[PDB]
Design an enzyme around this catalytic site. Structure first.
Site, short mmCIF file in Angstrom:
data_model
loop_
_atom_site.label_atom_id
_atom_site.label_comp_id
_atom_site.label_asym_id
_atom_site.label_seq_id
_atom_site.Cartn_x
_atom_site.Cartn_y
_atom_site.Cartn_z
N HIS A 115 36.91 -38.57 9.43
CA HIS A 115 36.95 -38.26 7.98
C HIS A 115 35.91 -37.22 7.58
O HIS A 115 35.93 -36.82 6.42
CB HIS A 115 36.85 -39.52 7.10
N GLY A 171 26.38 -40.36 3.40
CA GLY A 171 25.84 -39.58 4.54
C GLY A 171 25.30 -40.46 5.66
O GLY A 171 25.02 -39.88 6.74
N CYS A 195 27.21 -42.38 7.14
CA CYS A 195 28.44 -42.45 7.97
C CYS A 195 28.19 -41.85 9.36
O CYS A 195 27.54 -40.78 9.43
CB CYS A 195 29.59 -41.67 7.35
#
EC number: 3.4.19.12
Lengths: 305, 305
Positions: free
Chosen positions: B41, B143, B145
């Site tokens: 993503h 962020g 992630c």
């Protein structure tokens, strides 16, 4: 999103952890530049530990009596010294893995990360607080001694703690990296009173702010209070008194949440008075005092190193 | 002495954390040998995230659209690939800091360490459990992630988790390092039901054993019980059923404490029925289910790496 007890990343401390064996005694040491730091009680037999004369014990020792291992390497000592309760071993090899570092003496209520070690090998990392009575509630088995506490500001590891003792009562005591004990404790196996612990009021408030930020707001009361009146209730529940320095330090959480410190203080009071009614805050059924306002801001803003 | 939520030392994972920027999107990546792993993503705009066709989105991209930073280094991509929900970036430079590592898919109830990162820089480390409903209750800002979960067995880092999503409900979901989601979750910004969470019964028992080992024994009842009768009470309190595999796994704590598993189970039942009466176990007013029997043994025996 979410709120966890978070340790600093431990890599920069891992590559400083050495195994120290003098006579029989083996425990953890901190290898920075050309000096290994360890609890001076490594020179003690279980018998010595009862009533040690460190000056005298250290004299029946010389450079070559100390076995400092880094992994499978074996280091060589060229100058030994006793600074308060720490032994400084001057070795020939500077640690090439040496980070930017300072030694700091932290204040009661402040937090640090502990890298818990056995035989100079890292086993794990956890967050703790210097208690108001200068103990720490850690996890330390035999040979964990010489495990260090630290903070990371930016690129720079701030060493604040070395583990020396378990007290007959199960809590832990040790020193700064100049070998001054936190609290009244001595490096001797004799009964030692920790004294009355208090809750770190400013940390509990920090954590309530953290709870508001993560949508946990059931405890915000319509009431408010004053500093004097709050500190009356605080003293009853062995909470540390709150000062204007404490209110100031919480200013940014006040501003982020739009909740005045004294208002949050009125919430805390109702909690101290009425308990939790079996509800939870950030997954906990008790008031948490091992996050600083700094820790809460760091976790909530995503600061890195 | 003492019992703390303990993370694995994080150094070996720290030197694998890279910053990944495709178009605008920037998040954390895992640089092992010649491959960077990150949530697929990263190729999505906030608009894409609503209803992404990853195949189609990945096609309007090529090697040179992906900016992989390691500190102040800048890496070069020579082969991009989509494995389930992870993007694999083949780069020219093998990570010289690459540890011995495997990828493992962990079971619900198992624990791991998370190294939480922002812009490919480590901010902190904490312990968590895969919940029975395949979520995790972590601490993750935007962020974060591509932050990874891991275990260390000996010399070998076992990667088990990559963070992909916060759910509208505040809990976290992500993948194994082959990019298969834990649980029913998809990498799309749409409402997703976590489903009913249960307490990890075997972990709560592990922790009760931990409490006995550290002198906290107020909850040992004169009663005992049977597996069937215990699992009757378990189901009422959304505790996971206990199996003979669970009893077997607790065998060594049974042997260390001299307390039969089924006896400890009878203690748990009284606790589920009567609550805590406002008492605490290992400093906690609630039953803790994020220690495995393995974690409890590791902390109590002082295992290192």
């Amino acid at each position: 999103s979410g709120f966890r007890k978070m340790a600093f990343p431990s890599g920069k401390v891992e590559g400083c952890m050495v195994q120290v064996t003098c006579g029989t005694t083996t425990l953890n040491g901190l290898w920075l530049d050309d000096v290994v730091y360890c609890p001076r009680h490594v020179i003690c037999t279980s018998e010595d530990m009862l009533n040690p004369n460190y000056e005298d014990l250290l004299i029946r020792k010389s450079n070559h009596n100390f076995l400092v291992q880094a992994g499978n390497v074996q280091l060589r000592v060229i100058g030994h010294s006793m600074q308060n309760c720490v032994l400084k071993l001057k070795v020939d090899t500077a640690n090439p893995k040496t980070p930017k570092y300072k030694f700091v003496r932290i204040q009661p209520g402040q937090t640090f990360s502990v890298l818990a070690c056995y035989n100079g090998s890292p086993s794990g990392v956890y967050q703790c607080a210097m208690r108001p009575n200068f103990t720490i509630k850690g996890s330390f088995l035999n040979g964990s001694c010489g495990s260090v506490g630290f903070n990371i500001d930016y690129d720079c590891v701030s060493f604040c703690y070395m583990h020396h003792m378990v007290l007959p009562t199960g809590v832990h005591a040790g020193t700064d990296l100049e070998g001054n004990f936190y609290g009244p404790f001595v490096d001797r196996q004799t009964a030692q009173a920790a004294g009355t612990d208090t809750t770190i009021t400013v940390n509990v408030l920090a954590w309530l702010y953290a709870a508001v930020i993560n949508g946990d707001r059931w405890f915000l009361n319509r009431f408010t209070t004053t500093l004097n009146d709050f500190n009356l209730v605080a003293m009853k529940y062995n909470y540390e008194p709150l000062t204007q320095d404490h209110v100031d330090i919480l200013g940014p959480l006040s501003a982020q949440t739009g909740i005045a410190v004294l208002d949050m203080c009125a919430s805390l009071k109702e909690l101290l008075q009425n308990g939790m009614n079996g509800r939870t805050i950030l997954g906990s059924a008790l008031l948490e005092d091992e996050f600083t306002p700094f820790d809460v801001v760091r976790q909530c803003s995503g600061v890195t190193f």
